């Protein structure tokens, strides 16, 4: 059947550069390949159905090219509203298959995050479960190392995550992880702690609290 | 005759032509086109 | 004008067959068709059929031939799909599209779309979430702002709207995606950011609405000293 | 441990154009990607500039992406840094950092040694 | 085009008007996906 994929997989660059990317396909064909812009959970919006061609409604701010089994499609220009994932799809034949993706977003000087931490309360610990979250906030790169340090030890395999896409407002994203225990093996341990460090930092941060306290 | 946005014949596309140089020596000649015919007189006709 | 209405939430045991429906209204029925999309939490599409309700021709994926089946009515002016061995990976978005590109040369690709049905595929059972706060403590304060909020487990169907219930005391809120735990529950966490001058004394309370039930559930955050 | 340091810098007229050096022995290079930062006269510090294996382009801080560009050598260890018609602001200590984490998107300020560079 | 517009058992998006209830005039198109009048008189939309 037909496969196609998408390169490269992600682009970054500031509000008004130029942006262009490229799909390419197994069969080489000249026409019946078309082009998507979408967003997570969101509703994918046409662009290009056939190779460099266009309805009414698109906006010129969007084209394509190519011939063979790699065709381009090019962005005349970026704002923050824009961040999606565009995609190729392909109809010459009824199976049909769709890209792999590219993220487009904005590029930004470097933002420190918010750091804090989030410990427990007694009506979560009389359930028997005992958890703790932390908290980065509104910091650029897409991870930054978020360590839990129970007793002044590092800890791992007993967290979970969640993330943020990119915020439109002003380019930054946060990002989490929280922390899961039983009450056990909670009281097990006298003193919480979580450490950040980060690339506009000035030095490892740590965050901390205990249980006689 | 290259866009082939006529997939189907039933809407099917359109064109009008006006202003231009109509060298029917190339058009409809050149070796893609399989078939070429033309009713009521001759190409050689109409090229001039 | 043309557009589509999708029915509400739908939830059922695995492998169990389902009805859902595309509500299709604006100008003339006879001149729309309709197809199928479901899209996950990140996942990539999925495409499940194509009907033309006008003429009745349908064809299928063949992921999904055999096990799935549309059928559109004019009469009651909406289109249907069947579903049969449902599974936990069919927890999702499902979409109706509508293809008007077949009669004025834009071939083969949808333009409208309605509102989107989630499902879902779990041995769970529908109840409301579970809420507890949490207290910070003053030591904990960070440049003279401090944050509070709330998390919410253990609820059953999806969606659910976590928020704070009105007015401007949400300046400062923040709010995270979901997670499904291994026993069939979903989850959520939600934060918000209070200066020195109003924290604890603003008495904030998070609020959340189980919407399957329209059940509401809320809880207060207080700091300590 | 992951040790760097710097060479080069020093004295310059205003309006010229210099290189910094910077190069590291004993370790693999290709795991981290290779940063740069800069230290104005008493004040705090700020990034400056990175480079990465893929070699599509690189990244740079609002500063200098406009005047300056970056290089690394992934079979000699070699980075380098390109200074053009330096000003009175540019008078500062850099720092030659690893972005101290194996195969990682975003960075960590390991900055292992610097030196200053001036205008006259 | 069969050599590259093919599929094994595609090409569905090939179509052309099979029934209409009266010819078309010279150089006339018709965009119109009404239910032909089969026989009986056309029904609005519905089988029968």
Same mark, same amino acid.
């Given at each position: 059947?037909? @496969?196609?994929? @998408?390169?490269?997989?992600?682009?970054?660059?500031?509000?008004?550069?130029?942006?262009?990317?490229? &799909?390419?396909?197994?069969?080489?064909?000249?026409?019946?390949?078309?082009?998507?812009?979408?967003?997570?959970?969101?509703?994918?919006?046409?662009?290009?159905?056939?190779?460099?061609?266009?309805?009414?409604?698109?906006?010129?701010?969007?084209?394509?090219?190519?011939?063979?089994?790699?065709?381009?499609?090019?962005?005349?220009?970026?704002?923050?509203?824009?961040?999606?994932?565009?995609? &190729? @799809?392909?109809?010459?034949?009824?199976?049909?298959?769709?890209?792999?993706?590219?993220?487009?977003?904005?590029?930004?000087?470097?933002?420190?995050?918010?750091?804090?931490?989030?410990?427990?309360?007694?009506?979560?610990?009389?359930?028997?479960?005992?958890?703790?979250? &932390?908290?980065?906030?509104?910091?650029?790169?897409?991870?930054?190392?978020?360590?839990?340090?129970?007793?002044?030890?590092?800890?791992?395999?007993?967290?979970?995550?969640?993330?943020?896409?990119?915020?439109?407002?002003?380019?930054?994203?946060?990002?989490?992880?929280?922390?899961?225990?039983?009450?056990?093996?909670?009281?097990?341990?006298?003193?919480?702690? &979580?450490?950040?460090?980060?690339?506009?930092?000035?030095?490892?941060?740590?965050?901390?609290?205990?249980?006689?306290? | 005759?290259?866009?082939?946005?006529?997939?189907?014949?039933?809407?099917?596309?359109?064109?009008?032509?006006?202003?231009?140089?109509?060298?029917?020596?190339?058009?409809?000649?050149?070796?893609?086109?399989?078939?070429?015919?033309?009713?009521?007189?001759?190409?050689?006709?109409?090229?001039? | 004008?043309?557009?589509?209405?999708?029915?509400?939430?739908?939830?059922?045991?695995?492998?169990?067959?389902?009805?859902?429906?595309?509500?299709?209204?604006?100008?003339?029925?006879?001149?729309?068709?309709?197809?199928?999309?479901?899209?996950?939490?990140?996942?990539?599409? =999925?495409? $499940?059929?194509?009907?033309?309700?006008?003429?009745?021709?349908? %064809?299928?994926?063949?992921?999904?031939?055999?096990?799935?089946?549309?059928?559109?009515?004019?009469?009651?002016?909406?289109?249907? $799909?069947?579903?049969?061995?449902?599974?936990?990976?069919?927890?999702?978005?499902?979409?109706?599209?509508?293809?008007?590109?077949?009669?004025?040369?834009? =071939?083969?690709?949808?333009?409208?779309?309605?509102?989107?049905? $989630?499902?879902?595929?779990?041995?769970?059972?529908?109840?409301?979430?579970?809420?507890? !706060?949490?207290?910070?403590?003053?030591?904990?304060?960070?440049?003279?702002?401090?944050?509070?909020?709330?998390?919410?487990?253990?609820?059953?169907?999806? !969606?659910?709207?976590?928020?704070? %219930?009105?007015?401007?005391?949400?300046?400062?809120?923040?709010?995270?995606?979901?997670?499904?735990?291994?026993?069939?529950?979903?989850?959520?966490?939600?934060?918000?950011?209070?200066?020195?001058?109003?924290?604890?004394?603003?008495?904030?309370?998070?609020?959340? %609405?189980?919407?399957?039930? %329209?059940?509401?559930?809320?809880?207060?955050?207080?700091?300590?000293? | /441990?992951? /040790?760097?340091?710097?060479?080069?810098?020093?004295?310059? /007229?205003?309006?010229?154009?210099?290189?910094?050096? +910077?190069?590291?022995?004993?370790?693999?290079?290709?795991?981290?990607?290779?940063?740069? *930062?800069?230290?104005?006269?008493?004040?705090?510090?700020? *990034?400056?500039?990175?480079?990465?294996?893929?070699?599509?382009?690189?990244?740079?801080?609002?500063?200098?992406?406009?005047? *300056?560009?970056?290089?690394?050598?992934?079979?000699?260890?070699?980075?380098?840094?390109?200074?053009?018609?330096?000003?009175?602001?540019?008078?500062?200590?850099?720092? +030659?950092?690893?972005?101290?984490?194996? *195969?990682?998107?975003?960075?960590?300020?390991?900055?292992? /040694?610097?030196?200053?560079?001036?205008?006259? | 085009?069969?050599?590259?517009?093919?599929?094994?058992? #595609?090409?569905?998006?090939?179509?052309?008007?099979?029934?209409?209830?009266?010819?078309?005039?010279?150089?006339?198109?018709?965009?119109?996906?009404?239910?032909?009048?089969? #026989?009986?008189?056309?029904?609005? #939309?519905?089988? #029968?």
């Amino acid at each position: 059947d037909i @496969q196609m994929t @998408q390169s490269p997989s992600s682009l970054s660059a500031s509000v008004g550069d130029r942006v262009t990317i490229t &799909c390419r396909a197994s069969q080489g064909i000249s026409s019946w390949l078309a082009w998507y812009q979408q967003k997570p959970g969101k509703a994918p919006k046409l662009l290009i159905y056939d190779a460099s061609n266009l309805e009414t409604g698109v906006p010129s701010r969007f084209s394509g090219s190519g011939s063979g089994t790699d065709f381009t499609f090019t962005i005349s220009s970026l704002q923050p509203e824009d961040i999606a994932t565009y995609y &190729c @799809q392909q109809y010459d034949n009824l199976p049909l298959t769709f890209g792999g993706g590219t993220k487009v977003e904005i590029k930004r000087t470097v933002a420190a995050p918010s750091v804090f931490i989030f410990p427990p309360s007694d009506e979560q610990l009389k359930s028997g479960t005992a958890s703790v979250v &932390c908290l980065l906030n509104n910091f650029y790169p897409r991870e930054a190392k978020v360590q839990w340090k129970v007793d002044n030890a590092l800890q791992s395999g007993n967290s979970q995550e969640s993330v943020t896409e990119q915020d439109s407002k002003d380019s930054t994203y946060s990002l989490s992880s929280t922390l899961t225990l039983s009450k056990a093996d909670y009281e097990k341990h006298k003193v919480y702690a &979580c450490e950040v460090t980060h690339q506009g930092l000035s030095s490892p941060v740590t965050k901390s609290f205990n249980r006689g306290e | 005759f290259n866009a082939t946005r006529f997939a189907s014949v039933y809407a099917w596309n359109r064109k009008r032509i006006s202003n231009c140089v109509a060298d029917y020596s190339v058009l409809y000649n050149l070796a893609p086109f399989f078939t070429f015919k033309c009713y009521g007189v001759s190409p050689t006709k109409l090229n001039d | 004008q043309v557009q589509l209405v999708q029915s509400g939430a739908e939830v059922k045991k695995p492998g169990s067959s389902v009805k859902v429906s595309c509500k299709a209204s604006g100008g003339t029925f006879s001149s729309y068709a309709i197809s199928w999309v479901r899209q996950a939490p990140g996942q990539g599409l =999925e495409w $499940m059929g194509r009907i033309i309700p006008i003429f009745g021709t349908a %064809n299928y994926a063949q992921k999904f031939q055999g096990r799935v089946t549309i059928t559109a009515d004019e009469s009651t002016s909406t289109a249907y $799909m069947e579903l049969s061995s449902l599974r936990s990976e069919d927890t999702a978005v499902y979409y109706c599209a509508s293809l008007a590109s077949y009669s004025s040369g834009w =071939e083969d690709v949808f333009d409208i779309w309605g509102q989107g049905t $989630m499902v879902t595929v779990s041995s769970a059972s529908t109840k409301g979430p579970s809420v507890f !706060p949490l207290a910070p403590s003053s030591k904990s304060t960070s440049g003279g702002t401090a944050a509070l909020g709330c998390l919410v487990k253990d609820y059953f169907p999806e !969606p659910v709207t976590v928020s704070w %219930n009105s007015g401007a005391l949400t300046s400062g809120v923040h709010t995270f995606p979901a997670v499904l735990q291994s026993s069939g529950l979903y989850s959520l966490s939600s934060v918000v950011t209070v200066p020195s001058s109003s924290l604890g004394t603003q008495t904030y309370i998070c609020n959340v %609405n189980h919407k399957p039930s %329209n059940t509401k559930v809320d809880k207060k955050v207080e700091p300590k000293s | /441990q992951v /040790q760097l340091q710097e060479s080069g810098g020093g004295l310059v /007229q205003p309006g010229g154009s210099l290189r910094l050096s +910077c190069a590291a022995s004993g370790r693999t290079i290709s795991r981290y990607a290779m940063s740069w *930062f800069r230290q104005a006269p008493g004040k705090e510090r700020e *990034f400056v500039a990175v480079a990465r294996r893929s070699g599509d382009g690189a990244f740079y801080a609002d500063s200098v992406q406009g005047r *300056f560009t970056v290089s690394r050598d992934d079979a000699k260890n070699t980075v380098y840094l390109q200074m053009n018609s330096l000003k009175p602001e540019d008078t500062a200590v850099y720092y +030659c950092a690893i972005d101290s984490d194996t *195969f990682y998107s975003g960075s960590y300020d390991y900055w292992g /040694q610097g030196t200053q560079v001036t205008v006259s | 085009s069969n050599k590259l517009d093919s599929k094994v058992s #595609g090409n569905y998006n090939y179509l052309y008007r099979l029934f209409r209830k009266s010819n078309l005039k010279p150089f006339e198109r018709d965009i119109s996906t009404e239910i032909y009048q089969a #026989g009986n008189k056309p029904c609005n #939309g519905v089988a #029968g």
